[PDB]
Amino acid sequence: MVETEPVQGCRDFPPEAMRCRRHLFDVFHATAKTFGFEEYDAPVLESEELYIRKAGEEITEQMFNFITKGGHRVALRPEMTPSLARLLLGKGRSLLLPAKWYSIPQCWRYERRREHYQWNMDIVGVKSVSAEVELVCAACWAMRSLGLSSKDVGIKVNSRKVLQTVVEQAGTSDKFAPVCVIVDKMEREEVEAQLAVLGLTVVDAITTTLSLKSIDEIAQRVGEEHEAVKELRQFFEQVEAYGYGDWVLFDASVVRGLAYYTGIVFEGFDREGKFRALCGGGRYDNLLTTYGSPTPIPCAGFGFGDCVIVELLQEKRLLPDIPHVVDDVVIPFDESMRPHALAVLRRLRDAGRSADIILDKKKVVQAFNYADRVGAVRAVLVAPEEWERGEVQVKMLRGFAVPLDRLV
Amino acid sequence: MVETEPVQGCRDFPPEAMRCRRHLFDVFHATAKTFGFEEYDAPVLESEELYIRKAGEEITEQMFNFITKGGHRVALRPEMTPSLARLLLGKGRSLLLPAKWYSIPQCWRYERRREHYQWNMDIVGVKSVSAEVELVCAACWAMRSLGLSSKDVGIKVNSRKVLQTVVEQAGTSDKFAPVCVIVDKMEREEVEAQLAVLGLTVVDAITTTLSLKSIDEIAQRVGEEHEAVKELRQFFEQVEAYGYGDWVLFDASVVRGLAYYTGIVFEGFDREGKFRALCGGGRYDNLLTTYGSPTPIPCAGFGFGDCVIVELLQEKRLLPDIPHVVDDVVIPFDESMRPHALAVLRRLRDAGRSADIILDKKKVVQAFNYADRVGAVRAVLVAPEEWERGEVQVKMLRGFAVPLDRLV
Numbered sequence: 001m002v003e004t005e006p007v008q009g010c011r012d013f014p015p016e017a018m019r020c021r022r023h024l025f026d027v028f029h030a031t032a033k034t035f036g037f038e039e040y041d042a043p044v045l046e047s048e049e050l051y052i053r054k055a056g057e058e059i060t061e062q063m064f065n066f067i068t069k070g071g072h073r074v075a076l077r078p079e080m081t082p083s084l085a086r087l088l089l090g091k092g093r094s095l096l097l098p099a100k101w102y103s104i105p106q107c108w109r110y111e112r113r114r115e116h117y118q119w120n121m122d123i124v125g126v127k128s129v130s131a132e133v134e135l136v137c138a139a140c141w142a143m144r145s146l147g148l149s150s151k152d153v154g155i156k157v158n159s160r161k162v163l164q165t166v167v168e169q170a171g172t173s174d175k176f177a178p179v180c181v182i183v184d185k186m187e188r189e190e191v192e193a194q195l196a197v198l199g200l201t202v203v204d205a206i207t208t209t210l211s212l213k214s215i216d217e218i219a220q221r222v223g224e225e226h227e228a229v230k231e232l233r234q235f236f237e238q239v240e241a242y243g244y245g246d247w248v249l250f251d252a253s254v255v256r257g258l259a260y261y262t263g264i265v266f267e268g269f270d271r272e273g274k275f276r277a278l279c280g281g282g283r284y285d286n287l288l289t290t291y292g293s294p295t296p297i298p299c300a301g302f303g304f305g306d307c308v309i310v311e312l313l314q315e316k317r318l319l320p321d322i323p324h325v326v327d328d329v330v331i332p333f334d335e336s337m338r339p340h341a342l343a344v345l346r347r348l349r350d351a352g353r354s355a356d357i358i359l360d361k362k363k364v365v366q367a368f369n370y371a372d373r374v375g376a377v378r379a380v381l382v383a384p385e386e387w388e389r390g391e392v393q394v395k396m397l398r399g400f401a402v403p404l405d406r407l408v
Numbered sequence: 409m410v411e412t413e414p415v416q417g418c419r420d421f422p423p424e425a426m427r428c429r430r431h432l433f434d435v436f437h438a439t440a441k442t443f444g445f446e447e448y449d450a451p452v453l454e455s456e457e458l459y460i461r462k463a464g465e466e467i468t469e470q471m472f473n474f475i476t477k478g479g480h481r482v483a484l485r486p487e488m489t490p491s492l493a494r495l496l497l498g499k500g501r502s503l504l505l506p507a508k509w510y511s512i513p514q515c516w517r518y519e520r521r522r523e524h525y526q527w528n529m530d531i532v533g534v535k536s537v538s539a540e541v542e543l544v545c546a547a548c549w550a551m552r553s554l555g556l557s558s559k560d561v562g563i564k565v566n567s568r569k570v571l572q573t574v575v576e577q578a579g580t581s582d583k584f585a586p587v588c589v590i591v592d593k594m595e596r597e598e599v600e601a602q603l604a605v606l607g608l609t610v611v612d613a614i615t616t617t618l619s620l621k622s623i624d625e626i627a628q629r630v631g632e633e634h635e636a637v638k639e640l641r642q643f644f645e646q647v648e649a650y651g652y653g654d655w656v657l658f659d660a661s662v663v664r665g666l667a668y669y670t671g672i673v674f675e676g677f678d679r680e681g682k683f684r685a686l687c688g689g690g691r692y693d694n695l696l697t698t699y700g701s702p703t704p705i706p707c708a709g710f711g712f713g714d715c716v717i718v719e720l721l722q723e724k725r726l727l728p729d730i731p732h733v734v735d736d737v738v739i740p741f742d743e744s745m746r747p748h749a750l751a752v753l754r755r756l757r758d759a760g761r762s763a764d765i766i767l768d769k770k771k772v773v774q775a776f777n778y779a780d781r782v783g784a785v786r787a788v789l790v791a792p793e794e795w796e797r798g799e800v801q802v803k804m805l806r807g808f809a810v811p812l813d814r815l816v
């Protein structure tokens with residue numbers, strides 16, 4: 001008896017479960033198409049070097065990685081963005097900008113679930129916050145398309161520049177990424193200890209700025225035209241104008257856990273406070289300069305997982321079981337009628353219908369139950385008497401005789 | 409400067425290439441839907457035990473496998489069928505039969521390409537050759553849907569039972585799988601040496617039966633009602649009746665390289681003799697008994713790779729570059745018109761159109777070139793004068809003024 005359960009931390013997707021995933025992925029695809037994003041992909045197996053960002057990120061700490069027989073250090077990707085950057089760096093000048101690219105990669109971790117799918121959406125070559133607006137609107141669009149309202153969820157929005165100014169005014173730029181990574185852990189005294197463990201108080205000014213409840217209060221401390229203030233107002237104006245003002249809001253505690261975000265950062269959340277972040281993203285204008293690009297390339301994007309959204313949708317009763325369906329089930333009255341049943345099967349499919357034929361040998365009434373079981377819209381019985389007349393019997397399920405030509 | 413090339417033996421799919429893959433996958437999905445198959449998935453990471461079939465299979469020799477930090481023996485799947493069987497064994501009595509399941513998994517190997525996508529289609533719980541008929545017709549259907557004709561390709565069909573009878577008449581059942589695996593390598597004297605290396609001449613009778621050019625010649629040696637003869641005639645009758653008689657033919661040399669096939673086996677091929685097999689499959693009625701099932705479960709299916717088909721389609725000029733398209737590109741006359749452009753963007757998308765908005769700051773004529781570049785069907789300019797009139801300018805690309813309501 002072989003082991004029927006999957007490998008540790010991984011999910012099986014039999015048809016029932018697969019219909020749920022496909023319901024979600026259809027939306028991710030549909031939303032990307034609606035927003036003009038182009039699909040891409042890359043190996044799930046990338047070199048380990050790609051994720052050595054030396055900043056204590058949880059994503060790179062929990063990296064599912066190994067050595068090949070040939071000695072190479074690789075990993076099942078913990079995220080897509082580095083892969084995207086590699087592709088972009090590879091294209092160089094040939095890449096026409098701006099580019100809007102998406103994918104729904106499976107991503108991995110070691111030490112609970114070890115895999116998830118993550119819709120990625122990234123805009124490349126756009127300096128202005130219109131990028132972040134579009135991205136944030138796409139995330140809302142997908143949630144709305146799944147039946148969620150602005151009463152169910154929102155997106156918290158912030159800029160890392162505010163904090164950058166504080167870290168800059170408090171004496172070096174190099175430590176900013178480790179700082180963001182610790183500060184991200186705030187949601188206690190342990191995080192204060194980590195900031196001390198990093199070195200240097202500036203800790204106090206960080207806590208207060210994370211607690212500032214509005215942009216005007218940021219403007220009090222930054223002036224009405226810090227980059228961050230101008231950007232956020234621009235951001236909120238555009239999202240308001242697009243018609244999703246009830247979906248977004250400011251929150252100064254939002255930094256995200258990733259090292260490479262340089263500007264606007266954001267996070268999807270359920271308004272009942274029950275679930276982890278639904279999606280997360282931001283601007284990362286220096287990543288490609290880090291990977292070696294001679295010219296700086298502005299980038300922004302987000303990742304949107306397949307689990308939290310599903311738990312949420314289940315809680316809201318927005319994931320009813322989707323039963324399998326099929327247009328026609330062709331029933332041979334008996335085995336002598338099979339070749340004729342097959343010709344009819346061909347006609348049905350030729351015309352763009354989805355059809356089965358009873359493959360095994362069974363009595364008509366069993367075949368009808370089977371048809372009902374697989375969610376057939378109508379059953380097409382192919383019997384001798386009707387066949388002579390150039391006909392079949394058709395019964396709608398959601399037995400009048402019909403010519404072959406009139407079936408489709 | 410980071411490494412821009414992907415990991416060894418793996419493919420990047422930037423948008424250009426991804427459109428090609430998606431063109432192929434659309435057909436695999438569309439064909440599965442047409443034939444009533446239900447989608448499923450399972451981890452790419454499976455336990456290594458799943459593929460220890462001890463029969464010298466090339467698929468299990470070339471297994472991309474490793475040990476976890478926790479000591480477990482796993483592998484990136486070299487094929488899907490064992491995963492499918494695991495799922496089936498797991499369901500047991502709950503699984504309603506017959507079941508028709510499909511997937512388009514990425515599968516792996518170590519020692520040339522180390523990964524490929526493989527459309528799988530499997531029918532479970534059907535004793536009769538109607539299963540193999542359906543499967544073979546689906547494979548033809550996909551190739552026809554890609555623009556190929558029966559003049560371009562075919563499917564060679566055979567039964568392993570004929571040979572089984574010869575191995576049985578020549579003295580044990582246990583050695584049959586290793587024998588098939590060697591005999592599969594025939595397409596010289598090295599294969600004769602491998603049959604001797606296995607033991608035991610019966611070798612001679614094997615060579616002659618592989619060379620028998622028709623079923624009547626099989627019937628000469630098996631009788632008109634060997635299981636295999638009755639099955640193949642049944643098979644060919646049904647495929648003829650379905651209307652794909654020009655696509656299929658008998659070939660006694662076809663065994664396939666996999667251990668678990670017990671009955672009908674088949675192989676897609678280009679009629680110019682230029683390419684390796686396009687797809688391959690057959691009946692495997694004992695696999696689930698091997699994995700521990702208390703009741704025998706009849707199964708048949710095939711795998712259909714993503715590379716050979718593409719080379720073939722490229723040779724036949726059936727893979728023209730598919731350019732990106734989008735319905736609308738919204739052009740703000742300048743930055744003061746952005747909020748209005750955004751409201752229009754919202755209307756367009758609300759109505760099920762795919763639309764971009766010029767995200768960056770640029771002059772109208774650049775925005776029009778950009779629109780043409782991304783394959784926009786029409787450009788929607790949002791200027792002050794027209795906005796006052798409740799209007800925008802619309803230009804078809806494959807500048808009349810229009811009311812907002814009349815856009816969609």
Ligand SMILES: N[C@@H](Cc1c[nH]c[nH+]1)C(=O)O
Nearest residue numbers: 079081280281301302303
């Ligand atoms: N890679 C980020 C999301 C993201 C995509 N693009 C930019 N950010 C994450 O895994 O959370």
Ligand SMILES: N[C@@H](Cc1c[nH]c[nH+]1)C(=O)O
Nearest residue numbers: 487489688689709710711
């Ligand atoms: N797993 C087989 C194809 C197949 C699917 N189902 C049955 N056979 C292969 O890789 O060639």
Ligand SMILES: O=c1ccc(Br)c[nH]1
Nearest residue numbers: 078107108109115116
């Ligand atoms: O980076 C990640 C995060 C969560 C999971 Br599950 C896999 N990989």
Ligand SMILES: O=c1ccc(Br)c[nH]1
Nearest residue numbers: 486515516517523524
């Ligand atoms: O089993 C296989 C066969 C070919 C390739 Br590429 C990967 N895996």
